[PDB]
């Protein structure tokens, strides 16, 4: 239940965003030349919110804008993530100037979220005018699923989304649904917009086997590198510059919904290819056959991807989730946040999962089997 997105509220986010920009202007961090460039994303976010206000330039237009379900979620999320970034500098202290630290890692995670939020608002409010109820989902079979379950909604809670997705593509576990959430919920706000749904369905098409494509291509494929800048792709492949056909595929925060395959050419150079509006597995199959994509991440074994033309372990889902921000999500249901701690073992879960466990098995903690001497409500930050 977020507050109305009135002018007063919108401006509170600008002041919080200016605070993040000031903290990030410190030369000790060296963030001026540090992607995704938070010192560029936050001013651009300001200019977009300003462009939107110019389009809703009267009291009646401001009343419609402040009631817009997507806009309220956006401003509330922008507010939350900005406060989170200020809190990161407050508690990180000198560990913010060390590039390998977890505090710096969390700032890169926040910088990626602000990048995704900016691309989202520009897609939903092109030219500052709301067009979410007329957003074009690139895949028709994915568009039909969205229209079927959510009508003309532009954004829906993750918990409603997951359940409706399960009705068409079965999700096998709590860890799989958590890995899935960190993949689709790019803005890390516990909601899925039609834009985030379009990116996910473009990346892992065809829709008919989208969870098999995602499990193979992203959860277990050695060639998958998640978000990388081109300099990082080159740095990764430089080790294998002596092995033509070495390759990796990555996401690009400036080309959402598309893949970029970086590869070692016969003459030692590192080049990249952006596949067309076709499945990534077909581009990898064609490239393997043609001698360009042979060794994923320089490794001799290239997985057989032909099965996708016509089994992931719980540990693999756990490693996959580490990169994202899902530590606050209940591992059992993957739909509610952790809000209770079991005493004395310290394991965490949501209130309703603990009540369900207590009425079903209840013979110790559902994770370690230790006797439940007590419970204590808690608030979990994604970076705890």
Tell me which residues touch Na ion (CB under 5 A): 185, 187, 189, 191
Write out the two tokens for 260.
Answer: 């970029």
Could you tell me whether strands 155-157 and 340-343 are parallel, antiparallel, or unpaired per DSSP bridges?
unpaired
CB 133, min distance to Na ion, A? 18
Burial 242-266 (b: 16+ CB within 10 A, else e): eebbbbbbbbbbeebbbbbbbbbee
Report in angstroms how near the CB of residue 351 gets to Zn ion at its nearest: 8
User: Counting contacts by CB under 6 A, is residue 105 touching ligand Z3N?
Assistant: yes
How many residues make up the chain in this entry?
A: 384
Among 97, 367, 375, 382, binds Zn ion (CB under 5 A): 367
Q: Contacts for 342-345 with beta carbons within 8 Å, 24 or more apart? A: 342/370, 342/372, 342/374, 342/375, 343/372, 343/373, 343/374, 343/375, 343/376, 344/370, 344/373, 344/374, 345/370
Q: Which of 244, 296, 324, 366 binds ligand Z3N (CB under 6 A)?
A: 324
Q: What does the alpha-carbon distance between residue 213 and residue 307 come to, in Å, rounded to a whole number? A: 10
**Which residue's CB is nearer to ligand Z3N, number 72 or number 109?**
109
Is 185 labeled as ligand-binding? Answer: yes
**3, 226, 309, 378: which one contacts ligand Z3N (CB under 6 A)?**
226
Residue whose CB is less far from Na ion, 18 or 76? 76
Query: Total residues contacting Zn ion (rule CB under 5 A)?
Result: 12
The least distance separating Na ion from the CB of residue 51, rounded to whole angstroms, comes to 22
Task: Determine if residue 189 is labeled as part of a ligand binding site.
Answer: yes
* 187 is an annotated ligand-binding site residue: yes
Is 144 one of the annotated binding-site residues?
no
Q: Which is nearer to ligand Z3N, 36 or 275 (CB)?
A: 36
Q: How many other β-carbons are positioned within 10 Å of the β-carbon of residue 347?
A: 17
Residue of the chain from 330, 340, 348, 372 that contacts Zn ion (CB under 5 A): 330
For residues 111-130, which are near ligand Z3N according to CB under 6 A?
112
Closer residue to ligand Z3N, CB minimum distance, 199 or 294: 199
Q: Taken in order 379, 381, 382, 383, is the CA torsion positive or negative?
A: negative
- The phi and psi torsions of 260 (rounded to 5 degrees) equal -135, 120
Asked if 353 interacts with Zn ion (CB under 5 A), we say yes
Distances (CA, A) of 220 to 196, 240, 281, 363: 22, 21, 13, 34
Note the residues at the interface with ligand Z3N (CB under 6 A).
Answer: 35-36, 105, 108-109, 112, 182-183, 226-229, 232, 251, 253, 320-321, 323-324
């Amino acid at each position: 239940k977020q507050a109305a997105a009135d002018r007063r509220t919108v401006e509170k986010t600008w002041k919080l965003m200016d605070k993040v920009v000031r903290l990030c202007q410190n030369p000790k961090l060296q963030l001026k030349n540090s992607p995704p460039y938070i010192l560029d994303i936050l001013p651009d976010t300001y200019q977009h919110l300003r462009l939107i206000l110019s389009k809703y330039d009267d009291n009646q237009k401001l009343a419609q804008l402040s009631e817009n379900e997507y806009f309220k979620i956006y401003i509330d999320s922008l507010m939350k993530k900005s406060k989170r970034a200020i809190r990161l500098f407050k508690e990180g202290k000198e560990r913010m100037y060390e590039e390998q630290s977890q505090d710096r890692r969390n700032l890169t995670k926040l910088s990626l979220i602000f990048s995704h939020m900016l691309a989202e608002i520009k897609a939903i409010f092109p030219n500052g005018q709301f067009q979410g109820d007329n957003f074009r989902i690139t895949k028709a079979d994915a568009a039909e699923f969205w229209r079927k379950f959510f009508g003309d909604k532009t954004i829906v809670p993750w918990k409603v989304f997951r359940q409706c997705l399960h009705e068409v593509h079965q999700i096998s576990s709590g860890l799989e649904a958590m890995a899935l959430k960190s993949t689709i919920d790019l803005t890390c706000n516990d909601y899925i917009s039609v834009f985030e749904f379009d990116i996910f369905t473009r990346l892992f098409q065809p829709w008919g086997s989208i969870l098999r494509n995602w499990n193979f291509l992203a959860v277990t494929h050695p060639g998958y590198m998640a978000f990388l800048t081109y300099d990082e792709v080159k740095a990764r492949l430089q080790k294998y510059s002596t092995k033509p056909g070495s390759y990796i595929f990555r996401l690009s925060c400036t080309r959402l919904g598309q893949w970029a395959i970086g590869y070692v050419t016969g003459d030692g150079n590192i080049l990249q290819t952006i596949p067309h509006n076709k499945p990534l597995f077909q581009a990898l199959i064609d490239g393997s056959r043609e001698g360009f994509y042979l060794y994923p991440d320089g490794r001799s074994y290239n997985p057989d991807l032909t099965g996708l033309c016509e089994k992931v372990t719980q540990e693999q889902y756990e490693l996959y989730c580490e990169m994202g921000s899902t530590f606050q999500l209940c591992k059992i249901c993957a739909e509610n946040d952790k809000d209770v701690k079991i005493e004395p073992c310290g394991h965490l879960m949501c209130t309703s999962c603990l009540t369900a466990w207590q009425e079903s098995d209840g013979q110790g903690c559902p994770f370690c089997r230790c006797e439940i001497k007590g419970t204590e409500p808690i608030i979990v930050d994604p970076f705890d």
